[PDB]
Design a protein around this ligand. Structure first.
Ligand SMILES: Cc1cc2nc3c(=O)[nH]c(=O)nc-3n(C[C@H](O)[C@H](O)[C@H](O)COP(=O)(O)OP(=O)(O)OC[C@H]3O[C@@H](n4cnc5c(N)ncnc54)[C@H](O)[C@@H]3O)c2cc1C
Ligand SMILES: Cc1cc2nc3c(=O)[nH]c(=O)nc-3n(C[C@H](O)[C@H](O)[C@H](O)COP(=O)(O)OP(=O)(O)OC[C@H]3O[C@@H](n4cnc5c(N)ncnc54)[C@H](O)[C@@H]3O)c2cc1C
Lengths: 591, 594
C-alpha cells in the first residue's frame, strides 16, 4: 500500500466540524496570511511531496539505517535529496514566523502537514520537526542578535536545529545535568559535557546544525533552578554569514535502536564549544515552555501518523487477502475464499484503528485550535482560557495519541496474521517506529503525572471544568438525533468528574496517589475527550447524511467508537479507584 | 547496556508445582509416572535445565538477533554458536525430555517439560523454537505413524540428532489449510512423491542437525476437495539407509528465508518439494486429524513462549528499576547520600513492574494447571477423570495460547517502557523481547482463530458444559475457603458470576446470528483469562496464607496476589460491556466504506 494523504478527512475535521476559516477571517494577523483557498493549495502540495518523495524512502531507510564514519553521520540513500526538495518547497518553515522568512501558517495547518510527513516516513519527519521546535524557543527567548543571525536559515531549512538535553544519568531529572557553560570575556560561553539520544545531533541534510544545549554555569544552584539554555552551532558563523571554524564538538557515536533507524540518534560531545545564552541564566526550562507545548502535540501527531499509515496498509490488505468464508456464508462465490474483511474479528481490529485514528485526528486539530487561540486571539480572557486548555490537553495529546497509536499499529500488524511479521509488508516497522513516540519528549508516565499533579490537582480541577463545561453546553444544544451520541457522552463526562473528585480527595496528604492514578486516569480522560470529538463529528455527519457516502462512513465509525471503545472507561476508573495501596505492599527487595 | 543475566525461576516453579498443585501426590496414584519421575528426580532436571539455559543458550540471544540466519545457494546457516549450543543441548537429552521412553525420550510429564520449555524460551526464543518443532513432530509420529516409521525416525528425533518441521502453510493457505495444493503421487514401492511449495516453515532448513524430518500436508491425485482430501507425509531432507546411515539427498530444498520483525535466528523457509520421497502418516484424508494431539500440546507451548518473553523482560526490568536513579520518591527523598532515588520508588514504575509480575506469575500458574490437565488426560487410570481432563484441555488450551501471548506482549511493552528512552536501545534487550513476543500471537495460528475456537466449539459447541466443569471446580474451591482466604475467594466468586452471565448472554445471542461468535471471541477470551488468573491467584494465596512466616517468598506472593485483585481483575467489566455490544457495530459499514 502506497501512502495517500487523508486530505478528505482533514477537510472534514477543519472546514466542516471546526470551521476554522470562520476564525481566521476575524483575526487580521491570519487574515493576511491564510484563507480556505490558500490552506487547500498548501495541503494539496504537502500531500504530493509526502506521497511522492518521502513515503517511498520509509522501508529502505529502516533497512539501511544511518552510518557513522570518523564523526560524520550519513542518512540513508535519497534522504539528503528528499530533504533538499522538502526545504526548497518551504516545508521546514511552513508554521514559521514571517518576520524571519517563515510562511506563518497557523498550527491547525502545520499540524496537518506534520501528520502527512510523519505518516509517510516518521524518521524523515522528526528531522524538520527539530528545526521548527528550536525556532519556537529562539523566537520566544533569544536576543535580537541571535534571532537575526540564526532564524532565517533555520526557517528556510538551510540550517537544522537540535535539542541537546539528555545526559547518560539525566533524562526526566534534568536538574542533575553535568554539562557546564563557562562564561567568556567576549560575552560567549564554552560548553563542556556529554549529551545522549540527540535526534539529528549530526547528519548530512544541512551545512550547519544549531544545537540548543542545556547546561549550568559553574556557580549555578543545584536542581532545575540552576539550568540555562545555550545556542551552540556545529559550525561557527563568520561575521559576513559564511560558515567559519568547526565548533569544538562532535558526534562520538549513533545508537542501535528498535525503530526510526533512519533517525540519527547521537552521543554529542562538547569540548569547550562556543555558545550563547538563550533567555536568562537559571531559566533554561522556562526558555523551552512554548517549544514543549507545541512538541507535546507534535509527538501525539507522530504516534497518530503511524496508526494512519498502518490502517492504509491494513484496509488494502483486508480487501485483497482471501481466507476462509464469512460466518453467514460464502460472500465471494466467484473465488476459493472470502476477503478477510468479512470476518468479525478483522472488522473489530480495522474499526478500532479507524475510530482511534479519526478520533485522534479530530483531537489533534482541537488542541492545535487551542494553541492558535492562545497565540492569535485579540481578547485577553479568550487567550487565557485557551492557555489553560493548552496546559490541560497537551499532555493528553502526547500520551493518549501515542498509546492509541501503538494499539492501532499492533491491530494493523495482527490483521495480516503471520504475513504481518514479515518486514516487506511494512506493518512491523510502524509498530517499532510508533514505540519511539511513547518516550520522545519524555516518557508518557511523566506526561500523565503532569496532567494529574499540575493540571488537575494543581488547578483544583478548574482547568478540567473549562473543558467539561464546553462539552456540557454542547450536550445541552443537542437535537434528538444527536442524542444517540450526546447521551453516552454526558454519562462519560459525569464518570470523569466523579473520578476527578475521588482523586482530589484521595491525593490530600497522600503523594503516592497522584502517580498511582496518573496513566489510567489520563486514559479515562482520553476516551472521554474522543467521545466529545466523535459526537462533534457525528453532529456534522447527521446534518450532511445522504449528501455523500463519506458521512455514512463517519457515522458507522462513530457508532463503533461509542459501542465498543468508550466502555473502556469503566475498568480504568475502577483500577484508578483501587488507589496506591496495592502498589506499595512490597519493599524493593521483595520484587 | 546489556540484557540482564537470565536466572531460571526455580523457586517459583517449585511453589506452583510442589506447593500449590502438589504434583508428587498426583504422580503417586499414576503408575506410568511412579517409574520415571518423583520430586527429587524433577528438582535435579530443573537444576540442570537452569544451568544450560542460563550458561550456554541465553548468551546467544542478543548476538543471534543481530546476526540472523543466512541463505547461500540453498544452505541456511544459523548465527555463530547456535550449532555448538544445539549439540550441547541435544547431548544433554533436552530435545527428548517429554518424549516416549520406548524410543529413548526421558518420558517427563508435561508439567515438567512445560517448565523446561519456559526456561529455554526465556533464555533465547529463536533457539527454543528449534527443539520445540522436533518434540511436536514426535508427538504426531508417535500417535499416528506405522511401527516401521516410528522405529526408523523417532529415536534420532528424541535424541535431537534429527530435527522435525511442520510443513503446512502455502502462499494462499494459512488459517484455511483446507485449500492447500501440494500433491502426493503414490509410488509402486509404497512411498509417495510430494510436489509443491510451503512457506513460513520454521527450521525447514538449517545447520543444527544432519537430517530434518518434515511432516508435510498434501493431497493424493484422487483426493476429495477441501480439508477432507488432506493427508500427512513424513518427508526426510536426506533418505535413510537400512543401517540408519544417511543415503541420497531427497528432492527438496529451501528457496529463500524471510526477513522478519523478530526471532531473527529462527530460519523461516520457503520449502520447494520436487517429487520428494515420503511416506504416509496415519490415514489418507485424515492429515489434519493426525495433528490433533500435537496441536493441543503446541497451543500450551506457544502460550509458554509468550510468558517466557515476559519473564525475561521482568528480570531485566527489576534489576534496572533497582539500579537506575532518577527524581525523588513522591513522599520525600529516600537516597539521602545520592543525587536521585532508585526509580522503583515511583508509583508508575511499581504499577508497570507489578503488572508484569502478576501476569508472569499468574500465567506460570495457568500454564502448570493446563499441563496438569494434559497429564491427567494422558496418564489417569480413571475414565471419568481422563474424560473430564480432556474436556478442560479442549476448553483451556485456546485460552493458554491467546491469553498468555496477549499478556506476554503487554508484559514485554511494560518491561521496555520502564527503561524510558534506554528501553528503545537494542543493547538492553527489552525491544527484542517485544519483537520476539509478537511471533507468539501468530505462531500455531492467529490468536483470533484461537478465540473463535473457544467461543464457537468449546462454549457454543458444548452448550457451555465444558465451562461449567471449570466453574464447578472454582465454586467448590470458593465454598471451601476460610475467613482469611475470603479476601481473594469473594472477588473470585464475583468474577465467576460475571463470566457465567456473559456465557449465558453469548449462548442466547449467537442463536441464528453467526457474526456474534467472532464479534465476542477475543474480548470474551480475555474475560475468561482474567477470571482464570483470579482462580490461579486465589490458589497461590491459599498456600501463601497457610505458609506465611519465616520464608519471605510467601509475603512477596500475597503482595503480588493483592495487586492482581486490586488493579488487573477489574479489566473484566469493560471487556464484558464491549462483548455485550454485539456484532452490530462491526457490520454497519460495507467493505467499500472503510
Ligand atoms: C530515539 C530517542 C530519541 C531521543 N531524542 C532526544 C533528543 O533529541 N534530545 C534529548 O535531549 N532527548 C532525547 N531523547 C531522550 C528522551 O526524551 C527520553 O525518553 C528521556 O531522556 C527519558 O528516558 P531515560 O532513558 O533518560 O529515562 P529516565 O528519565 O531515567 O526514566 C526511567 C524511568 O523512570 C521513570 N521516572 C523517572 N522519573 C520519574 C518521576 N519523577 N515520576 C515517575 N516516573 C519517573 C520514567 O518514566 C521511566 O520509566 C531521546 C530518546 C530516544 C530513545
Ligand atoms: C514466523 C512464522 C513462522 C511460521 N512457522 C510455521 C511453520 O513452521 N509451519 C507452518 O505450517 N506454518 C508456519 N507459519 C504460518 C502460521 O502458523 C500461520 O499460518 C499464520 O500465522 C496465519 O497467518 P496468515 O498470514 O497465513 O493469515 P491468514 O490465514 O491469511 O489470515 C489473515 C487474517 O484473517 C484472519 N482470519 C482468517 N480466517 C479467519 C476466520 N475464519 N475467522 C476469523 N478470522 C480469520 C486471521 O486471523 C488474520 O487476521 C509461520 C508463520 C510465521 C509468521
Amino acid at each position: 500500500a502506497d501512502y495517500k494523504a487523508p486530505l478528505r478527512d482533514m477537510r472534514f475535521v477543519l472546514n466542516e466540524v471546526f470551521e476554522v476559516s470562520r476564525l481566521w477571517a476575524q483575526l487580521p494577523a491570519l487574515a493576511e496570511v491564510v484563507d480556505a483557498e490558500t490552506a487547500a493549495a498548501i495541503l494539496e502540495e504537502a500531500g504530493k511531496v509526502t506521497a511522492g518523495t518521502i513515503a517511498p524512502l520509509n522501508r529502505p531507510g529502516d533497512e539501511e539505517g544511518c552510518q557513522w564514519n570518523a564523526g560524520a553521520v550519513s542518512t540513508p540513500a535519497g534522504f539528503p535529496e528528499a530533504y533538499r526538495t522538502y526545504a526548497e518547497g518551504g516545508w521546514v518553515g511552513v508554521g514559521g514566523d514571517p518576520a524571519y522568512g517563515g510562511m506563518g501558517m497557523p498550527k491547525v495547518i502545520s499540524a496537518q502537514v506534520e501528520e502527512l510527513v510523519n505518516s509517510a516516513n516518521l524518521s524523515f519527519g522528526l528531522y524538520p520537526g527539530l528545526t521548527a521546535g528550536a525556532c519556537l524557543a529562539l523566537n520566544a527567548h533569544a536576543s535580537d542578535e541571535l534571532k537575526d543571525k540564526y532564524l532565517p536559515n533555520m526557517y528556510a531549512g538551510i540550517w537544522a536545529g537540535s535539542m541537546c538535553l539528555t545526559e547518560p544519568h539525566a533524562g526526566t531529572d534534568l536538574g542533575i545535568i553535568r554539562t557546564r557553560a563557562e562564561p567568556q570575556a567576549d560575552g560567549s560561553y564554552k560548553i563542556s559535557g556529554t549529551k545522549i539520544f540527540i535526534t539529528g545531533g549530526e547528519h548530512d541534510l544541512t551545512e550547519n546544525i544549531i544545537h540548543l544545549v542545556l547546561a549550568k554555569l559553574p556557580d549555578a544552584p543545584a536542581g532545575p533552578k540552576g539550568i540555562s539554555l545555550f545556542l551552540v552551532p556545529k559550525v561557527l558563523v563568520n561575521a559576513d554569514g559564511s560558515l567559519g571554524e568547526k565548533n569544538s564538538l562532535g558526534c562520538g557515536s549513533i545508537e542501535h535502536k528498535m525503530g526510526i533507524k533512519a533517525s540519527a540518534t547521537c552521543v554529542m560531545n562538547f569540548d569547550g564549544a562556543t555558545g550563547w545564552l538563550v533567555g536568562e541564566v537559571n531559566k533554561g526550562l522556562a526558555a523551552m515552555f512554548t517549544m514543549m507545548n507545541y512538541a507535546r502535540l507534535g509527538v501525539g501527531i507522530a504516534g497518530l501518523a503511524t496508526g494512519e499509515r498502518s490502517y492504509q496498509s491494513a484496509i488494502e490488505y483486508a480487501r485483497e487477502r482471501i481466507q476462509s468464508r464469512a460466518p453467514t456464508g460464502p460472500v465471494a462465490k466467484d473465488k476459493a475464499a472470502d476477503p478477510i474483511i468479512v470476518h468479525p474479528d478483522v472488522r473489530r481490529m480495522l474499526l478500532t484503528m479507524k475510530a482511534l485514528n479519526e478520533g485522534g485526528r479530530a483531537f489533534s486539530s482541537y488542541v492545535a485550535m487551542q494553541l492558535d487561540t492562545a497565540k492569535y486571539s485579540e481578547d485577553a480572557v479568550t487567550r487565557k482560557r485557551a492557555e489553560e486548555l493548552v496546559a490541560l490537553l497537551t499532555p493528553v495529546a502526547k500520551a493518549f495519541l501515542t498509546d492509541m497509536g501503538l494499539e492501532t499499529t499492533i491491530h494493523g500488524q495482527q490483521i495480516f496474521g503471520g504475513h504481518g511479521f514479515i518486514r516487506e509488508w511494512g506493518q512491523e516497522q510502524l509498530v517499532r517506529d510508533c514505540r519511539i513516540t511513547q518516550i520522545y519528549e519524555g516518557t508518557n508516565g511523566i506526561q500523565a503525572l503532569d496532567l494529574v499533579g499540575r493540571k488537575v490537582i494543581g488547578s483544583g480541577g478548574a482547568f478540567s471544568r473549562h473543558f467539561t463545561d464546553e462539552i456540557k453546553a454542547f450536550v445541552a444544544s443537542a437535537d434528538e438525533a444527536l442524542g444517540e451520541f450526546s447521551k453516552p457522552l454526558a454519562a462519560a463526562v459525569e464518570n470523569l468528574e466523579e473520578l476527578t473528585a475521588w482523586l482530589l480527595d484521595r491525593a490530600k496528604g497522600n503523594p503516592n496517589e497522584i502517580g498511582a492514578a496518573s496513566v489510567e486516569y489520563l486514559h479515562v480522560f482520553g476516551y472521554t475527550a474522543y467521545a466529545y470529538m466523535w459526537a462533534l463529528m457525528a453532529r456534522t455527519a447527521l446534518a450532511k447524511q445522504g449528501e455523500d457516502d463519506f458521512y455514512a462512513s463517519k457515522l458507522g465509525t462513530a457508532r463503533f467508537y461509542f459501542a465498543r471503545l468508550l466502555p473502556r472507561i469503566h475498568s480504568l476508573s475502577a483500577s484508578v479507584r483501587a488507589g496506591s495501596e496495592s502498589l506499595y505492599l512490597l519493599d524493593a527487595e521483595q520484587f
